[PDB]
Amino acid sequence: RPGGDTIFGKIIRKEIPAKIIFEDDRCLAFHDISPQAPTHFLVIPKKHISQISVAEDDDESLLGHLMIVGKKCAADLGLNKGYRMVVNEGSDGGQSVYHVHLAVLGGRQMHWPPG
Amino acid sequence: GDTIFGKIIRKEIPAKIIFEDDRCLAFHDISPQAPTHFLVIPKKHISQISVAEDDDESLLGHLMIVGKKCAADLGLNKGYRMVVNEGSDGGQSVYHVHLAVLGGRQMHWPPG
Ligand SMILES: Nc1ncnc2c1ncn2[C@@H]1O[C@H](CO)[C@@H](O)[C@H]1O
């Protein structure tokens, strides 16, 4: 509206506060309010895409940008020992907000399997 | 490159291939952690996501779109989880960038 009225769309439009790490014209990185690792943040597109399963072919650059921004933010946040990037899709993926997001978790040893 | 994923790309050792194009390969993981568990990897040898170049941005997105399409082809209509591991804390097992896609069961939180 632009960004939609999911909570993530509201965050994009500064209508709900968030702890922002990085912002550009395509995406926003901000900390997760329910962290599952010592560092846990999200990278979201400003364009509303509900879930990765409905992303268009022409969304490739944008999706890749989420990953590049995620890795840059992880470096800026000092995650020199590594981290895990996660995209949850739908019910089995554990998706809770239908605005696609890349989660980045680090600052501890991550285990296998990844859930 | 110089990892087992390079050997798989070069067809030197076998893998159950799901999809291929000029720039990536998708194949079932040898150690599956879900009823469906596959990888999408670039043919370009990027060792880890932390060293990916800005110019690789659309290639990385291509891995995700290919992962989405393969998931649908493999019947993952209830959802799935995509994972990229970086470094030792991330549990990265092979130093060749890979996007893992897992589904066919409920995935749990935290994701490791
Ligand atoms: N207002 C919010 N600010 C930051 N993260 C959020 C917010 N609401 C939900 N999340 C996080 O989004 C993730 C998936 O929707 C979860 O890890 C959850 O904690």
Author numbering:
A (entry chain A): 12 to 126
B (entry chain B): 15 to 126
Reproduce text from the manuscript describing this model.
We then made an H114A mutant to inactivate the hydrolysis activity of HINT1. Finally, to reveal the molecular specificity of Ap4A to induce HAn, we further solved the co-crystal structures of HINT1H114A-ATP and HINT1H114A-Ap3A. Only the AMP portion of these molecules were resolved in the adenosine pockets of HINT1, with the remaining atoms of ATP or Ap3A untraceable. Neither ATP (with only one adenosine moiety) nor Ap3A (with a shorter phosphodiester linkage) could recruit HINT1 dimers to form polymer in solution. Our results show that Ap3A, Ap5A, AMP, and ATP could not induce HINT1 polymerization. The five-phosphate linkage in Ap5A adopted a bent and zigzag conformation compared with the straight conformation of Ap4A, suggesting that the increased length of Ap5A is too long to stabilize the HAn interface as Ap4A does. Together, these results indicate that the bivalent characteristic, the length of the phosphodiester linkage, and the interaction of phosphates of Ap4A with HINT1 were all critical for HAn formation.
Diadenosine-5′,5-P1,P4-tetraphosphate (Ap4A) is a ubiquitous second messenger from bacteria to higher eukaryotes, which responds to environmental stresses and cell cycle phases. Ap4A then binds to the histidine triad nucleotide-binding protein 1 (HINT1), thereby disrupting the protein–protein interaction with microphthalmia-associated transcription factor (MITF), and the released MITF eventually promotes the transcription of mast cell activation genes. The HINT1 protein is a compact and symmetric dimer, with two adenosine pockets at opposite sides. Here we report that Ap4A specifically polymerizes HINT1 into (HINT1-Ap4A)n (HAn) filaments in solution and in the activated RBL cells.
